[PDB]
Design a protein around this ligand. Structure first.
Ligand SMILES: C[C@H](CCC(=O)NCCC[N+](C)(C)C[C@H](O)CS(=O)(=O)O)[C@H]1CC[C@H]2[C@@H]3[C@H](O)C[C@@H]4C[C@H](O)CC[C@]4(C)[C@H]3C[C@H](O)[C@]12C
Ligand SMILES: C[C@H](CCC(=O)NCCC[N+](C)(C)C[C@H](O)CS(=O)(=O)O)[C@H]1CC[C@H]2[C@@H]3[C@H](O)C[C@@H]4C[C@H](O)CC[C@]4(C)[C@H]3C[C@H](O)[C@]12C
Ligand SMILES: [Mg+2]
Ligand SMILES: [Zn+2]
Ligand SMILES: [Zn+2]
Lengths: 1337, 99, 49, 50, 79
DNA sequence: TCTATATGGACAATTCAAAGGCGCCCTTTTAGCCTTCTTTTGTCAATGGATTTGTG
DNA sequence: CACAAATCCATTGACAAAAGAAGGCTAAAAGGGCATATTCCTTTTGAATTGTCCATATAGA
């Protein structure tokens, strides 16, 4: 039909083009015979007829006269839905400034005229005149004149002079302004001046005038001369039942505009005084203004009730505009909801769905079926047949139901698995029975949670609900490959109670002939369900390449594991059900069954595991009671002891020995210790306290405490909640967060008295008030996310790049916190991995590192892998299938088509709610150094002279297991290659200290050092050793304010010692508080300390802030460029940093504050990307300095740090795709051949294709500076204006695209969902590619 | 509650509220993303065009559904076209480049 | 409400998440059978016809 | 008459429902004893003392 | 039939082109122009399309070929 | 060398957009209404041939 | 296998209802004209821009 939406300014001639006739009067209807009263806002003449094919005067009332405008009252007899499309205009008596181009924050009429907003409004309010066409008269053009000044001028200049005011003055300016002339002017002046604010304003204005000339617009189309009216059935005056009318608000706003308009025409007919027509033109400007957008300019003209009217811009804007409310999320036919409930007989491809809802939803189908089988002659007869609910409609429903998916849904639809299509089962009742393995996906309790059943009408949508959306097709979470059909709470109790083992039950140690007579020994009443036994299980292995090898052997097992083996399907080993089978073990069982036997056995085994888990959990009667909560017999003793101890601390605070805060932390640590003793006692009495006896005296195994089994299976509750029931509960903190110093010593089996309960209530309500409001935020994080990665869609099978990233195990200070297998599982290698000895050629480049390749990587101890990633992708407008990886769910590689921006945003966002002095080696290893400019101190150790020497512990395997950070000038007892073993401090330094240890030895000389100007003389009493403290700049006097104390070492001859490697003198200037150890005359030895110097947000604002990329408050100023450091002025502040490379130019200069610490030394050398101070990094800076891989590894490691601290799993692919959608823009450094401004910010894809095409020719490509935008700015500065208007503020986006004449060629998912057509993502991708080839064939 | 075809809103020809007006469910943004995350671009299209808003296509869908023919005709949802007349009734001009 | 003989045991998943498994004697003794009273209205208005 | 779930107590931690199940059982036990004294209808001396 | 569409995807790759192939073929069977190949087990036209597709006896190439054959016969209805 | 003079640069107020899921009196002019009229549009009832069996 | 009769399709014609109009009417809707004197209304967070000082570089004295 069409293929792009253009937006531009509407002209007077265009506005008269849409319209069918001026609306002259404000009458709506005739109040007695409610006719559209011509010719007011609902004019039958102008906007159409009121009933189909009937004139208004009643003369013509039949389709015989389609199209004939009547003679008597002139109403074109046509369908009355023309009433809903025909627009009308209003001929404004005076011009009137369109508010959007006058009050949008950067004012378009403002910066077009290069005129401040205040003066433009002083002209528009009819305050002050404005000059136009100054001629030869000694005035400017924009020269603002008040009454006084004009009154002076006009007495002298009746000619060659002119000064309008109000909207006509602005129209005259925009009509006389020439765009090409002033554009050349601005370019020559950009050629002239170089001031950042000046040049920025210049380039902004030049960009606007370029847009406004390149476009077809005009300036004077801003000041409205002819206003349009919306139709009459989009602003209706429908009469609600009761004789009361129910008008819209636009009827009010138009009625007011037209009244003030007609009145102004009169006030110009009577030749009125000036002040009255000025007042009327102001009132009309206000009225047109409050119509186009109300509440923008000044206060909102209030509606009749008492309220601001909802003017047009409030139609479109906000959470309830057309864009988000009626256009992205529609209400839907064929849909219903009722309470959900359990129904465990179900197979997990079906949902029990009630007869009555199903007969209501499926009435078109039933009517067609009945009149097809002939049981009902006409459609009306079929209607009354199904309304009477005869015995044939239920047969017909059971038949038009049969193979037909429905789409259950739950209200907060966080991730893409909360819409799964089931196959209905017709079930009595009024509750939608939902399968019990599905609650983990939907996140459903069965205490009232309602669900919506939509319907796939057509044939293609039944196919997509069956293939794509079915419930047996997404049993793996798209955020990480692990299963989401994990048996949940009763079923794991049933398995954990089957597959356990008492010590002396019936049938202890009797040999069974297979699983079959284990089941018979159980059901017959001869063996206990867990009484250890020898059986003959015959497992299979998939050893042969696709074949099943049989084998049998007397495994030692129990009756329970033997009864459970009758379900493990044919591929798995027996040692997978020969353990205890908690919850981790059972999700593991399903995962390995998925990875060995594919999908169908995993689904049928999921159901068999549900059924047997439910059955034996029922058979166990695992009931809970007040005697299953065993209090330790040592709890009152523990509390008495800790209480007496805290009384001792009360005394030692009353005797002045201890400070207040120290006394506090004393008491608080003592209660933490007693609490942990009570907890550990209850657990030692709770877990094993079953003592038994087999043919002998006494043994003890794990217990059968009902509450303990429920806590040990993984069914419900952790050891924390068990702790609160048995042991004393917690140390409840006051709403300050200042933890109380007397814990609620009593648990829920005893009674919390009134005090203890009232103290529990604080935290109870804080938790509830959070979890109410974490859904406010994290519903907005996902919204911004899935609105930034809207369009990012897998659009090529491969783009053939060699780029990548280096996937390695995170090592968070010593203990590794994520292996390499989880990180490089499913991603495609970019370079062929080599064997550790290099030994070989190994895994090819473009392979996919699925499970078995993680086996080859883990067996051979691979050190690290480089693997292709989305943020190093060369595809245009997409992300190819190899540079992405695989999925999670459907284990194979990503399909050419699938929409990964969305499942990426959803995965990163739906777990939002779940969120809030010396190195000591830990295990075996051989120490390995990293970036170590060490030197031997005067003691013989190893001191490192590089702040960025990370301390590794390379095991003998060939990998890293420890990674600590060694500060500058540490002192290492060990070195590189010196083997060490656990519990061994190999590093030593002091954090409060900062030494200035040099690289040469000799006499210490005070060079350019004077007491009072360079140093202080202040002897310490209790020590006596003098330190002439090196103070900073502005503290010392003025004659030496530029005189800096430098330390430089020499030999006995006086000549300056030559540094190892350099012939430069090592004179070292000291900073403020650089208190020196040894003075002049005292020679310092090797590696000798010269002088000392003195010296978190998290949860999901930390993730919100790593994604919006907000700059921190004290960034860590990176090293702009590589070379040497120097100070030249030291400041009128401040401090001045100078980086002087070895060969390149060096006009660099950075106004560092002297208030901050400076990590580097004045006489040291730093690489770019090195820190020249401390504190957090900034992501913009990381991007500017170290490429994209630096910033992307930063964003990933930070936000995965959050999600991992909270124990959630998210595959890094998704954070990398959001990071790609963050850095999609790039500023043209200097336009190489053609054709951009070198301050312009063009899409990286477009300048990339441009310089690729130009370098394809002979010319010179464009140099581009990659940017990094936050997610809100990233999504709001897009090529397509509909997908920016929908998201967030619609006023700015519409007005900017309007002036810039921007054109939307859809090519997105948000646009093709707005405009009602196939999303170009999954099944629609074929349609859109075929369409792109069907154009331009 | 359940709604095969009922009474439709006035300005934007979509269904009504909940169970008192006999009104379809809300298929809001989050469910649209959950269909875009699959490939259901056919399901989603009939979900926001025929079942909901396309005021000609929805009667012509009911006719097909009774004729034993599960086709559809996509067209332009009426609420988008309300959007065009409301923007275009500002000073803006937003039209459909035809080709 | 009314008090009735409960029992804390998993019963084959008909009380899975928080669901409840009411026996037929509670529906049969009419002990949770409530009485709801609605008010329909047929207003008879005056139209120009 | 109703079969609630064991696995709801340790995680929600409303131990009240269990103590109140137990004491309700005690109470309905005294109810059964008094009903048994009023079916045999022996004397009001035994009822009064019980 | 039918619980899953795994094997039908292993035969017709890409898992969305499966949907389009099955929907085209089910329209053929439903709009009264053709006739199932594999014996219908009392399936609606959708599951029959997917059952056809599983056996390797229908996909996009076969559908194009049959369409061109049957449209050439209508040219051969020129008499 | 010292100061100023301003200028470009770093700093502080101001405004805007976001913040989740199911008075009166009279006078005149106008338009809705009703009633009869006339011409139109169907309905009630005749009057003839061309079409359909019967007989021998 | 022809000749005699009952059963069909067409115009005459008049006759009654029905509608399009027209006038005569009346309810209603819209102007116009008022003269003791009347003098001024009733929640934060972040980003970006704009108006405000600071570093500073240069130019004259
Ligand atoms: C749901 C709401 C109760 C919420 C508390 C109640 C209170 C007022 C009710 C409406 C009014 O009668 C006006 C209107 C009359 C129409 O004729 C029929 C529809 C309308 C919209 C009614 C439907 C509904 O019942 C309303 C919204
Ligand atoms: C403001 C109030 C909010 C509810 C509190 C709204 C909601 C719907 C409104 C009523 C409906 O129109 C129905 C009804 C029509 C009558 O004929 C005229 C008055 C009635 C009573 C309305 C008055 C009021 O405005 C209501 C109650
Ligand atoms: Mg719930
Ligand atoms: Zn008319
Ligand atoms: Zn790629």
């Amino acid at each position: 039909e069409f293929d792009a939406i253009k937006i531009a300014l509407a002209s007077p001639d265009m506005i008269r083009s849409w319209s069918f006739g001026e609306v002259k009067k404000p009458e709506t209807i005739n109040y007695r015979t409610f006719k559209p009263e011509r010719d007011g806002l609902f004019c039958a003449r102008i906007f159409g007829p009121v009933k189909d094919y009937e004139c208004l005067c009643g003369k013509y009332k039949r389709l015989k006269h389609r199209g004939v405008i009547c003679e008597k009252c002139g109403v074109e007899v046509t369908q009355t839905k023309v009433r809903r499309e025909r627009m009308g205009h209003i001929e404004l008596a005076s011009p009137t400034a369109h508010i959007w181009f006058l009050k949008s924050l950067p004012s378009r009429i403002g910066l077009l005229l290069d005129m401040p907003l205040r003066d433009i409004e002083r002209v528009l309010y009819f305050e002050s005149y404005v000059v136009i066409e100054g001629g030869m008269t000694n005035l400017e053009r924009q020269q603002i004149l008040t009454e006084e000044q004009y009154l002076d001028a006009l007495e002298e200049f009746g000619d060659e002079f002119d000064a309008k005011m109000g909207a006509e003055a602005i129209q005259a300016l925009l009509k006389s302004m020439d765009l090409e002339q002033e554009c050349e002017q601005l370019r020559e002046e950009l050629n002239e001046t170089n001031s950042e604010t000046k040049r920025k304003k210049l380039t902004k204005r030049i960009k606007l005038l370029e847009a406004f000339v390149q476009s077809g617009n005009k300036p004077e189309w801003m000041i409205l001369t002819v206003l349009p009216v919306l139709p009459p059935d989009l602003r209706p005056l429908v009469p609600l039942d009761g004789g009361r009318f129910a008008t819209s608000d636009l009827n009010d706003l138009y009625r007011r505009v037209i009244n003030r308009n007609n009145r102004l025409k009169r006030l110009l007919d009577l030749a009125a005084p000036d002040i009255i027509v000025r007042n009327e033109k102001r009132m009309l400007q206000e009225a047109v203004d409050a119509l186009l957008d109300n509440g923008r300019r000044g206060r909102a003209i209030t509606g009749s009730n008492k309220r601001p009217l909802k003017s047009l811009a409030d139609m479109i804007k906000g959470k309830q505009g057309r864009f988000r409310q009626n256009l992205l999320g529609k209400r839907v036919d064929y849909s219903g909801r009722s309470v959900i409930t359990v129904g465990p007989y179900l197979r997990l491809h079906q949902c029990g769905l009630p007869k009555k809802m199903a007969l209501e939803l499926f009435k078109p189908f039933i009517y067609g079926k009945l009149e097809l089988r002939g049981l009902a002659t006409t459609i009306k007869a079929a209607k009354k047949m199904v309304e009477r609910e005869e015995a044939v409609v239920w047969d017909i429903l059971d038949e038009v139901i049969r193979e037909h998916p429905v789409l259950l849904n739950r209200a907060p639809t966080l991730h893409r698995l909360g819409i799964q299509a089931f196959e209905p089962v017709l079930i009595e009742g009024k509750a939608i029975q939902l399968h019990p393995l599905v609650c983990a996906a939907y996140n459903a309790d069965f205490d009232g949670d309602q669900m919506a059943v939509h319907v796939p009408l057509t044939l293609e949508a039944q196919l997509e609900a069956r293939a794509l959306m079915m419930s047996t097709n997404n049993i793996l979470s798209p955020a990480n490959g692990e299963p989401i059909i994990v048996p949940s709470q009763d079923v794991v109790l049933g398995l954990y109670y089957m597959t356990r083992d008492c010590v002396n039950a019936k049938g202890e140690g009797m040999v069974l002939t297979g699983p079959k007579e284990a089941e018979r020994l159980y059901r017959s009443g001869l063996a206990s369900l867990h009484a250890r036994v020898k059986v003959r299980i015959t497992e299979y292995e998939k050893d042969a390449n696709g074949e099943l090898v049989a084998k049998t052997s007397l495994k030692d097992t129990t009756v329970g594991r033997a009864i459970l083996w009758m379900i493990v399907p044919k591929g798995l080993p027996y040692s997978i059900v020969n353990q205890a089978l908690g919850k981790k073990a059972i999700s593991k069982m399903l995962n390995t069954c998925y990875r060995i036997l594919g999908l169908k056995p995993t689904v049928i085994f999921a159901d068999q595991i549900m059924y047997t888990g439910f059955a034996y959990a029922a058979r166990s009667g695992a009931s809970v009671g007040i005697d299953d909560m065993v209090i330790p017999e040592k709890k009152h003793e523990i509390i008495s002891e800790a209480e007496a101890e805290v009384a001792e601390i009360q005394e030692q605070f009353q005797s002045g020995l201890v400070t207040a805060g120290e006394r506090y932390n004393k008491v608080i640590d003592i209660w933490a210790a007693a609490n942990d003793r009570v907890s550990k006692a209850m657990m030692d009495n709770l877990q094993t306290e079953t003592v038994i006896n087999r043919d002998g005296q006494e043994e003890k195994q794990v217990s059968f405490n009902s509450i303990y089994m429920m806590a040990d299976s993984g069914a419900r509750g952790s050891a924390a909640q068990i702790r609160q029931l048995a042991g004393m509960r917690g140390l409840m903190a006051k709403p300050d967060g200042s933890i109380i110093e007397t814990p609620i010593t009593a648990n829920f089996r005893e009674g919390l008295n009134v005090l203890q309960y009232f103290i529990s209530t604080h935290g109870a309500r804080k938790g509830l008030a959070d979890t109410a409001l974490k859904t406010a935020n994290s519903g907005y994080l996902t919204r911004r996310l899935v609105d930034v990665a809207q369009d990012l869609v897998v659009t090529e099978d491969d783009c053939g790049t060699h780029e990548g990233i280096m996937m390695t195990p995170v090592i968070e200070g010593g203990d590794v916190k994520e292996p390499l297998r989880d990180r490089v599982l499913g991603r495609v290698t970019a370079e062929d991995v080599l064997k550790p000895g290099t030994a070989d050629i190994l895994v090819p480049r473009n392979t996919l590192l699925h499970e078995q390749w993680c086996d080859l990587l883990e067996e051979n101890s691979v050190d690290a892998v480089k693997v292709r990633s989305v943020v190093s992708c060369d595809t245009d407008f997409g992300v190819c299938a190899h540079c992405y990886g695989r999925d999670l769910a459907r284990g194979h590689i990503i399909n050419k088509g699938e929409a990964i921006g969305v499942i990426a945003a959803q995965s990163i966002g739906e777990p939002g709610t779940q969120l809030t002095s010396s190195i000591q080696v830990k295990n075996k290893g051989s120490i390995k150094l990293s970036n170590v400019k060490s030197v031997v101190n005067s003691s013989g150790k190893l001191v490192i002279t590089s702040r960025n020497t990370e301390l590794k512990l390379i095991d003998e395997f060939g990998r890293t297991k420890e990674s600590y950070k060694v500060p500058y000038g540490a002192v290492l007892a060990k070195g590189d290659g010196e083997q060490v073993a656990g519990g061994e401090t190999v590093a030593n330094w002091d954090p409060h200290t900062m030494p200035v240890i040099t690289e040469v030895s000799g006499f210490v000389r005070f060079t350019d050092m004077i007491d009072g100007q360079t140093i202080t003389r202040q002897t310490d009493e209790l020590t006596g050793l003098s330190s002439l403290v090196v103070l900073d700049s502005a503290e010392r006097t003025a004659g030496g304010k530029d005189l800096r104390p430098a330390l430089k070492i020499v030999d006995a001859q006086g000549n300056d010692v030559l540094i190892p490697g350099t012939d430069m003198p090592a004179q070292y200037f000291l900073p403020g508080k650089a208190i020196v150890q040894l003075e002049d005359g005292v020679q310092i030895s090797s590696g000798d300390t010269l002088a000392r110097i003195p010296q978190i947000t998290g949860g999901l604002p930390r993730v919100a802030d790593l994604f919006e990329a907000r700059r921190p408050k004290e960034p860590a100023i990176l090293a702009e460029i590589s070379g040497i450091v120097s100070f030249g002025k030291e400041t009128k502040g401040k401090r001045r940093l100078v980086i002087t490379p070895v060969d390149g130019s060096d006009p660099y200069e950075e106004m560092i504050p002297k208030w901050r610490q400076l990590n580097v030394f004045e006489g040291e050398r730093v690489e770019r990307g090195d820190v020249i101070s401390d504190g957090p990094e900034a992501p913009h800076d990381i991007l500017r300095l170290r490429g994209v891989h630096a910033v992307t590894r930063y964003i990933v490691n930070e936000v995965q740090d959050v999600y991992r601290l909270q124990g959630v799993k998210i595959n890094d692919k998704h954070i990398e795709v959001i990071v790609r959608q963050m850095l999609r823009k790039a500023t043209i450094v200097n336009a190489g051949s053609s054709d951009f401004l070198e301050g312009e910010q063009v899409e990286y894809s477009r300048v990339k294709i441009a310089n690729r095409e130009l370098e394809a020719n002979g010319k010179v490509g464009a140099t581009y500076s990659r940017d990094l935008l936050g997610i809100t700015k990233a999504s709001l500065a897009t090529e397509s204006f509909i997908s920016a208007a929908s998201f967030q503020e619609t006023t700015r986006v519409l007005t900017e695209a309007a002036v810039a004449g921007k054109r939307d060629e859809l090519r997105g998912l948000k646009e093709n969902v707005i405009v009602g057509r196939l999303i170009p993502a999954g099944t629609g991708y074929a349609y859109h590619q075929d369409r792109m080839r069907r154009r331009a064939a | 509650h359940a709604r095969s075809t009922g009474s439709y809103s006035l300005v934007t020809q979509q269904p009504l509220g909940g169970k008192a007006q006999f009104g379809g469910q809300r298929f809001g943004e989050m469910e649209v993303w959950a269909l875009e995350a699959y490939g259901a671009a056919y399901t989603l299209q009939e979900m926001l065009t025929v079942k909901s808003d396309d005021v000609n296509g929805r009667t012509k869908m009911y006719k097909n559904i009774v004729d034993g023919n599960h086709q559809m005709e996509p067209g332009m949802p009426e609420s988008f076209n309300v959007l065009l007349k409301e923007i275009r009734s500002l000073g803006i001009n937003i039209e459909l480049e035809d080709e | 409400g009314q008090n009735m003989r409960v029992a804390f045991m998993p019963w084959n998943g008909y009380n899975f998440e928080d669901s409840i498994l009411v026996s037929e004697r509670v529906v049969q003794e009419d002990r949770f059978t409530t009485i709801h009273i609605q008010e329909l209205a047929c207003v008879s208005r005056d139209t120009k016809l | 008459d109703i079969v609630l779930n064991p696995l709801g107590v340790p995680s929600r931690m409303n131990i009240g429902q269990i103590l109140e199940t137990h004491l309700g059982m005690a109470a309905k036990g005294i109810g059964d004893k008094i009903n048994a004294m009023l079916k045999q209808q022996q004397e009001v001396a035994k009822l009064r003392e019980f | 039939a039918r619980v899953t569409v795994q094997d039908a995807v292993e035969k017709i790759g890409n898992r969305f082109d499966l949907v389009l192939v099955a929907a085209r073929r089910a329209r053929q069977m439903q709009v009264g122009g053709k006739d199932p190949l594999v014996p219908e087990e009392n399936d609606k036209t959708t599951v029959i399309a997917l059952r056809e597709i599983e056996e390797g006896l229908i996909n996009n190439q076969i559908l194009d070929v049959r369409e061109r054959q049957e449209q050439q016969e209508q040219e051969a209805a020129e008499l």
